[PDB]
Amino acid sequence: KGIPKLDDANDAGGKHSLECTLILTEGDSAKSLAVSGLGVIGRDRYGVFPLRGKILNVREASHKQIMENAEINNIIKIVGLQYKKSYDDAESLKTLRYGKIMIMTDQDQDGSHIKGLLINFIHHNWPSLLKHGFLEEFITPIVKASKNKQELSFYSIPEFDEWKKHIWKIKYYKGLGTSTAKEAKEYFADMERHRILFRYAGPEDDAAITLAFSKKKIDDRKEWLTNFMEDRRQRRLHGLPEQFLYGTATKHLTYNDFINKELILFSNSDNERSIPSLVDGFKPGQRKVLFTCFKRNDKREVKVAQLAGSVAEMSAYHHGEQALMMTIVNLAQNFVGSNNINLLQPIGQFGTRLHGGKDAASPRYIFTMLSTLARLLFPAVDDNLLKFLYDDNQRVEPEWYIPIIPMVLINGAEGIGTGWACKLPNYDAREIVNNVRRMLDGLDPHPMLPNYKNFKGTIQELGQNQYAVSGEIFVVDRNTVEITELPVRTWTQVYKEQVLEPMLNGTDKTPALISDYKEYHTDTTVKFVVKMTEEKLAQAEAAGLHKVFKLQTTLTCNSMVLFDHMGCLKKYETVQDILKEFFDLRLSYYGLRKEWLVGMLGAESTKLNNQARFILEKIQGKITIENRSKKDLIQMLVQRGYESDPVKAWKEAQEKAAEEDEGPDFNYILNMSLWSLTKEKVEELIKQRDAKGREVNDLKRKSPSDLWKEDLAAFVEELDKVESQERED
Amino acid sequence: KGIPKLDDANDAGGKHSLECTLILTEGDSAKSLAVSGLGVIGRDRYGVFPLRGKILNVREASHKQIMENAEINNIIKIVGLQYKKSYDDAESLKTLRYGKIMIMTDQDQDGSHIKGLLINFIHHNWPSLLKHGFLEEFITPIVKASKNKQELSFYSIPEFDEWKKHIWKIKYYKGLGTSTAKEAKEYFADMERHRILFRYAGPEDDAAITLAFSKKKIDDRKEWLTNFMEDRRQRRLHGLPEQFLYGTATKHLTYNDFINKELILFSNSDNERSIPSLVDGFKPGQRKVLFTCFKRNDKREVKVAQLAGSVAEMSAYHHGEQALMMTIVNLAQNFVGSNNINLLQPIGQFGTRLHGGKDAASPRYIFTMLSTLARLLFPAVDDNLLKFLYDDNQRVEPEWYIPIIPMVLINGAEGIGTGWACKLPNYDAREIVNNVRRMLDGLDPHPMLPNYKNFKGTIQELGQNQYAVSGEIFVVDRNTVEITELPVRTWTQVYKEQVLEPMLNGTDKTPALISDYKEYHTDTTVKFVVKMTEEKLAQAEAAGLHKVFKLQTTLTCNSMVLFDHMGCLKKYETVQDILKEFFDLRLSYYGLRKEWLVGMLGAESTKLNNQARFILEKIQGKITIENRSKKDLIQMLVQRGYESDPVKAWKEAQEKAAEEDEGPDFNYILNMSLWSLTKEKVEELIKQRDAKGREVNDLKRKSPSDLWKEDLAAFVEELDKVESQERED
DNA sequence: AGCCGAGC
DNA sequence: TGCAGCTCGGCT
DNA sequence: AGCCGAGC
DNA sequence: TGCAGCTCGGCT
């Protein structure tokens, strides 16, 4: 033909076309898996063609984007399909080169989404094909369990998890690429277990597909996921299993059951990775990046590409690394309209306001590291209070961090899921610190306007969650105006191509409005000088300059959707709602921080006490350890008043409160240096001990608010340092 | 005006053409440096055009490769040159678009080489231009020193090194890319000290250029570098300076002085990075890689691209990282005809014999780590005997590693320099181990034939350093032969395309000789089955099958050129020369290893002695340390028989033995565990002490030859394990 | 006529 | 940043 | 009609 | 493994 990545069945287009199956694979390695799996014999009736990734949702796409979609058009050419055609009698089916399409994807949520889009494609264009078995799938296992003789295959994590309810070598298949050639030829030998047939069952199949993929069914999807989330929350409260879909010998799957028990898992997982948490402002990928950074604790820059590989490994990030690198870049950007406080330093070219960051260099050629602000906003001390998650016996990132200000409002959370989307604008950090200080003194918080670091324009409320964002334009003389700010997130080059150039050149609907203009930007600032006739500039000030030069955009925030501290999606009407809920939790954790520090400092002081009485007890000699025995001396030591390691006797302890959530050791004296008994080391132990006694008391005095205020002071000091240093470059 | 990377002087080609200078830069960053350095003002009379890297040596190039060289053709179009033309009267000069070329390169040896090739280009094609000031250079500093007010520039490392004027912040410029825009505009403001003009002085200039770049002057270059190396040995023996070339206010440099004082430094550095050392078989880049691996001590695979960045940093490798990655790949390859013992593991697709390794994947996508054989061949214990080099104030790789067999013959050292080249074939490791064992027992070594791991053919001597290498071909029946080995370094696809295909298809000079052939290879083996008429097969066996099917190559080794242990180039006539010279050195270092271990183990036992007598003294109470003073016991313990840390009293001392190359510490008792006074710590010290006494005695009895034999045994066992494991995959 | 490889 | 097509000497 | 970004 | 052109919802 003329399609490069296609491997056409030898019998395709011939006389056995209707006995031919085209295999559509998620990506190029899946294709390789298919071709080796099919072998020599399989090339007669089985084609293989790979799609790059997600494909166009044709159901309400535009005519133009449909007719220009090379991948959709390739499928149509391979299969021999024809739009508007009905495939019912024997003449219609003579034009097909293939009789069926078999979909082969990762056994994961994003695979289910691709299958859904393919189903959506056939359902919307050739329902005569879809009602008569034209579509199947080739499933493969997500997890395998091998005892010694017999090898097991599980097609979903809940199936595998529940099989553990019996009593031994476990391998995980993250994508089709994990399988080997020998495993592939195995799968295709057992076609009867791996081929599943999509059955069309009635109108409820149409309703289901439409519910998942129609632009007119956003409300229905909201209800649909709300049921799923609460209903899952229930089974998961009453310890019931979570249902899975490929445990039976059934070779049939209705479109309704696919949508409602498989595609819905993608939709829910999509919201989980795309909608941020109220508590720390992160999405899970972001949180993993930052957990990895905290773990490495890099004193020097790290190449973005390398940090991504490190993040993937250290935190169990199972997606492609390009996206992770894009996430790292987005976290480090610091131009006007991106982050108000970038937690990662952009060491290299991470993007500018001239192109909205799309001029960032390759992640192989730029570097980053923690901003000095990062551990001031996410104090390491508080790590002792989080719930670290597990991914296959590996401890990874927490469910959320508990920062000292609501980061969710500092950098403007944004995410698109299914059913819901999130858009929060940026808020000034100092204004938030002040509102926290107000609430900490029993005052009501002040209402807050959106505010973008280094933005020189103005933002004014219009109604609730509606704001007028304006740049800066000045009249210079009767012929000249100067533009010195664009509205937030209007990029310099876009404005120049879409506003000034049409004003200079005229259009078909409008003649030219300006006579000339020149540019005078820096990397981080905007200066256009625009020339006009006296008359035209007089009618531009009359008609309002911000209007004429399109220096005004609306900003509407009626979709502030976030996961609360419990992991429930929730819609916040105002940012003050968000700030009160955050405040209310963060103040609780300061209470546990004070509690936790009391326990540890106490163990540290009780420790320093046993360490103390021993040494000065053998300074004058009331106990002997010379040529005794481990046997004797531990029992000798319990016999007297000496405690087994109090720090290790307070860590094991606080465990056991969290255990129930979802021998004697005197080494601390005895591992002590032999030096510890000398007057210029004994006097230091008494001071250290007496200092530690005061440490617990100096903190015993403090309120949680006192601790929070301390953190806030330390933060604003560094923020002053860091931001003015930024300005001197 | 159709060339993409050129920035043409606004006045180029116009009427001031002969006042225009084209600037040729080493790469695209140098170009950028030139454009910002020149600014708006400089674009009238100054062009900028970048060359990718090294360029064609046109002096005896072929007509075809000259006429097809896009870069040389680009220069000719930009400047307006014309071959065979003489540029003398005013009509001839009317065709030039530019009056002179200014060369801008790194201030390093590879920059000088590029300048030389450009000079060579002009000298060979337009001597009327080169004799009348057509060529200049723009030098920049390699080192800068900034005091507080005044900033200094050095244009050669010996000049910066030669400045005994001492009493302040030193920066190094590795390439033109180190400079900033501000530094560039500075350089171009001071055009008068950065522009140097090449002067043609007489025939000695022609002789010098010809000496450096003519294919007929290899012998002369050999003499030329021999003088340089020996004369340098002298200037560096009596502690005299090495003259440098840009310290004066002279703005003129003859071609003869450029060749003989600047280009020669490239020629010598070229041999140093391309000609291996006899002692360990490495080139300096390779040695740096392996030093980095030994340092990291990676228990797990590392991305090749990442290891390269690590090597650059950890070992001060100042060249581009693409080349380093190629070196890592070459070190890890293990197909037939590459390494007999790959010291790095090829974890991924590092190349196959089907394409001579040129099918290796990208270094961003493949992994490696030390072979378990590496520290068996280069024992870590022996690192204490090496001379680690210094780059700036960083300790880096040694001058050579001294392995337990002559690695220079295991993997076939090869390199192309200037004046000399090196080619060693592979030699069987077990045959070398046996020859070392023979020499270790006072026997003469056996002569050795080249031998390639997994090569199934034969290698036979023809004369001195000449060998017939043969693949394997069999007669199967009256119509069929089978080819099961190609001669070493004949790659499968090349043989198929250049031998079998012309035999199958015929050519214009010869008709077809075979009727069919089929392939049956693995990734690591060769199987062709070839069909012929009975008559044709009979005339092929008569004429000899290895001849007919070109399964025989000659291997000639009359250029076994290596740096000896002193860093002098040497030409070895036979492989036995190489092995005897290696033998005498390696046997010496086994003597120092025995010496070193004796000294160290002794300090360790003298240490365990003081540590021992001490504990037994306050076991029964002959010393009191309870509540005394650091003041007191340093003199208290020295007053009595106690030695300050002997290990750290054997290292500090042994330092100063290498110094001449070019208070009391009793913490080891007192930092001891408080447990040191215990039933199971006293007897544990007595065995430990008494074991260490036996340690020195078991080793005092051993000969150096005994130690080498031990190493060889441990090595051969692991080579047996590793090589059969290789065969079961 | 072009390979071998450490460089630009 | 490295590109792509070259360097350098001795064979083949 | 297209941005916003975490995914394939 | 990523490509390139998409998904998904709410504005603009």
Distance CA A273, CA A284 (A): 6
In angstroms, the separation between the Cα of residue A690 and the nearest Cα of chain B is 19
Chain A contact residues (CB < 8 Å to B): 303, 306, 309, 364, 618-619, 621, 625-630, 633, 669-680, 682
Cross-chain Cβ contact B677/A626 below 8 Å: yes
In angstroms, the separation between the Cα of residue B682 and the nearest Cα of chain A is 8
Residues A416, A421, A422, A425, Cα dihedral to 10°:
80
Contacts of A716 (CB under 8 A, 6+ apart): A430, A433
Q: Name the residue closest to the C1' of D7 by its CA.
A: B54
Q: Which residue in B182, B627, B676, B680 has the most chain A C-beta atoms within 10 A of its own C-beta, making it the best mutation to test that interface?
A: B627
Pick the catalytic residue from B365, B520, B589, B642: B365
Which residues of chain B form CATH 1.10.268.10?
A: 594-700
Cross-chain Cβ contact A626/B618 below 8 Å: yes
Q: For chain A, first and last CA: distance in Å?
A: 58
- CATH number attached to the domain at A275-454+559-593+701-729: 3.90.199.10
Q: How far is CA A373 from the centre of its chain?
A: 21
| Distance CA A325 to C1' F3 in A | 16
| Distance CA B99 to C1' E7 in A | 58
Kind of pairing, strands A528-531 and A516-519?
Answer: antiparallel
User: What are the residue ranges of helices labelled H in A501-627?
Assistant: 501-505, 534-542, 545-548, 575-620
Cross-chain Cβ contact B625/A669 below 8 Å: no
The torsion angles phi and psi of B682, rounded to 5 degrees, stand at -75, -55
Q: What would the two tokens of residue A353 be?
A: 């306001």
Q: Is the dihedral of CA B62, B64, B67, B68 positive or negative?
A: negative
Q: Is the dihedral of CA A223, A225, A226, A231 positive or negative?
A: positive
Q: Which residues of B touch A671 (CB under 8 A)?
A: 673-675
Type and span of the H or E element at A369:
none
Nearest residue, CB atoms, A674 vs list B630, B674, B679: B674
User: What are the residue ranges of helices labelled H in A344-472?
Assistant: 374-377, 407-410, 429-440
Q: How far is CA B7 from the centre of its chain?
A: 36
Distance CA A560, CA B32 (A): 47
Type and span of the H or E element at A421:
strand A421-423
User: What are the residue ranges of helices labelled H in B415-533?
Assistant: 429-440, 492-495, 501-505
| Distance CA A362 to C1' D2 in A | 13
Q: What would the two tokens of residue A135 be?
A: 């579509």
Distance CA A102, CA A106 (A): 13
Nearest to B34 by CA among B5, B11, B76, B14: B5
Q: Which residues of A touch B629 (CB under 8 A)?
A: 678-680
By CB atoms closer than 10 A (0-12, 13-18, 19+), residue A216 is exposed
Find which nucleotide's C1' atom is closest to A111's CA. Answer: E8
In our burial notation (b when 16+ CB lie closer than 10 A, e otherwise), range A335-372 reads bbbbbbbbbbbbbbebbbbbebbeebeebeebbbbbbe
Helix (H, G, I), strand (E, B) or coil at A454: coil
Nearest residue, CB atoms, B673 vs list A629, A633, A674: A674
User: Which residues of A are known to be catalytic?
Assistant: 365
Distance CA A277, CA A415 (A): 11
Q: Name the residue closest to the C1' of D1 by its CA.
A: A365
Distance CA A26, CA A5 (A): 13
Q: Name the residue closest to the C1' of E7 by its CA.
A: A323
Q: Which residues of A touch B627 (CB under 8 A)?
A: 619, 677-679, 682
Helix (H, G, I), strand (E, B) or coil at B470: strand
Q: For chain B, first and last CA: distance in Å?
A: 58
Which residues of chain A form CATH 3.90.199.10?
A: 275-454+559-593+701-729
Cross-chain Cβ contact A627/B675 below 8 Å: no
Cross-chain Cβ contact B619/A626 below 8 Å: yes
| Distance CA B316 to C1' C8 in A | 18
Half-sphere exposure of B656 (CA within 13 A, CB side): 5
| Distance CA A305 to C1' F2 in A | 13
In angstroms, the Cα distances linking A409 to A438, A461, B157 are 17, 17, 55
Q: What would the two tokens of residue A256 be?
A: 């309704």
Protein contacts on strand D: list nucleotides below 7 Å from a Cβ: 1-12
Distance CA A247, CA A157 (A): 11
Place of tokens 């791996």: A194
Kind of pairing, strands B302-303 and B100-104?
Answer: unpaired
Q: Are B682 and B619 in contact (CB under 8 A)?
A: yes
Helix (H, G, I), strand (E, B) or coil at B61: coil
Protein contacts on strand F: list nucleotides below 7 Å from a Cβ: 1-12
Q: Name the residue closest to the C1' of F2 by its CA.
A: A322
Nearest residue, CB atoms, A676 vs list B618, B674, B675: B674
Nearest to B344 by CA among B355, B358, B356, B330: B330
Contacts of B649 (CB under 8 A, 6+ apart): B603, B643, B665
Fold of A455-558: Gyrase A; domain 2 (3.30.1360)
Chain B contact residues (CB < 8 Å to A): 303, 306, 309, 364, 618-619, 621, 625-630, 633, 669-680, 682
Which residues of chain B form CATH 3.40.50.670?
A: 1-274
Q: Confirm whether any atom of chain E, the nucleic acid strand, is less than 7 Å from CB of A261.
A: no
Q: Confirm whether any atom of chain D, the nucleic acid strand, is less than 7 Å from CB of B215.
A: yes
Nearest to B185 by CA among B291, B37, B287, B360: B37
Find which nucleotide's C1' atom is closest to B423's CA. Answer: D10
Distance CA B51, CA B117 (A): 12
Distance CA B93, CA B711 (A): 73
In angstroms, the Cα distances linking B456 to A697, B466, B473, B727 are 81, 19, 11, 14
Q: Which residues touch strand C (CB under 7 A)?
A: B 26-27, 52-54, 106, 110, 114, 273-274, 283-286, 318-320, 322-324, 326-327, 330, 338, 356-358, 414-416, 423, 489, 491
A151 is in an annotated binding site: no
Q: How far is CA A433 from the centre of its chain?
A: 26
Fold of B1-274: Rossmann fold (3.40.50)
Distance CA B59, CA B124 (A): 6
Q: Which residue in A310, A623, A633, A674 has the most chain B C-beta atoms within 10 A of its own C-beta, making it the best mutation to test that interface?
A: A674
| Distance CA A609 to C1' D5 in A | 75
Strand partners for B416: B421
Q: Are A647 and A607 in contact (CB under 8 A)?
A: yes
| Distance CA B423 to C1' D9 in A | 10
Q: Which residues of A touch B625 (CB under 8 A)?
A: 674, 677-678
User: What are the residue ranges of helices labelled H in A166-217?
Assistant: 181-189, 191-194, 203-213
Distance CA B580, CA B512 (A): 52
Q: Confirm whether any atom of chain D, the nucleic acid strand, is less than 7 Å from CB of B97.
A: no
B108 is in an annotated binding site: yes
Q: Is the dihedral of CA B588, B589, B590, B592 positive or negative?
A: positive
Distance CA B322, CA B308 (A): 8
Residues B348, B354, B356, B362, Cα dihedral to 10°:
-30
In angstroms, the separation between the Cα of residue B364 and the nearest Cα of chain A is 10
DSSP state of A297: -
Amino acid in the structure at residue B95: T
Q: What would the two tokens of residue A105 be?
A: 């994807």
- Count of CB atoms within 10 A of residue A165's CB? 7
Identify the experimental approach: X-ray
By CB atoms closer than 10 A (0-12, 13-18, 19+), residue A713 is exposed
Q: Confirm whether any atom of chain E, the nucleic acid strand, is less than 7 Å from CB of A323.
A: yes
DSSP state of B671: T
Q: Are B130 and B123 in contact (CB under 8 A)?
A: yes
Helix (H, G, I), strand (E, B) or coil at A89: coil
In angstroms, the separation between the Cα of residue B673 and the nearest Cα of chain A is 5
- Count of CB atoms within 10 A of residue B614's CB? 24
Nearest to B132 by CA among B86, B173, B176: B86
Which residues of chain A form CATH 3.30.1360.40?
A: 455-558
Contacts of A309 (CB under 8 A, 6+ apart): A321, B303
User: What are the residue ranges of helices labelled H in A621-678?
Assistant: 630-639, 648-659, 667-670
Q: Confirm whether any atom of chain D, the nucleic acid strand, is less than 7 Å from CB of B69.
A: yes
Cross-chain Cβ contact B674/A679 below 8 Å: no
DSSP state of B344: B
Helix (H, G, I), strand (E, B) or coil at A490: coil
Q: What would the two tokens of residue B500 be?
A: 């079998």
Amino acid in the structure at residue A487: P
Distance CA B444, CA A633 (A): 66
Q: Are B449 and B467 in contact (CB under 8 A)?
A: yes
The per-residue DSSP string of A116-169 comes to: HHHHHHHHHH-HHHHTTT-EEEE---SEEEE-SS-EEEESSHHHHHHHTT---E
- CATH number attached to the domain at B594-700: 1.10.268.10
Q: Which residues of A touch B677 (CB under 8 A)?
A: 625-627
Nearest to A71 by CA among A52, A84, A96: A52
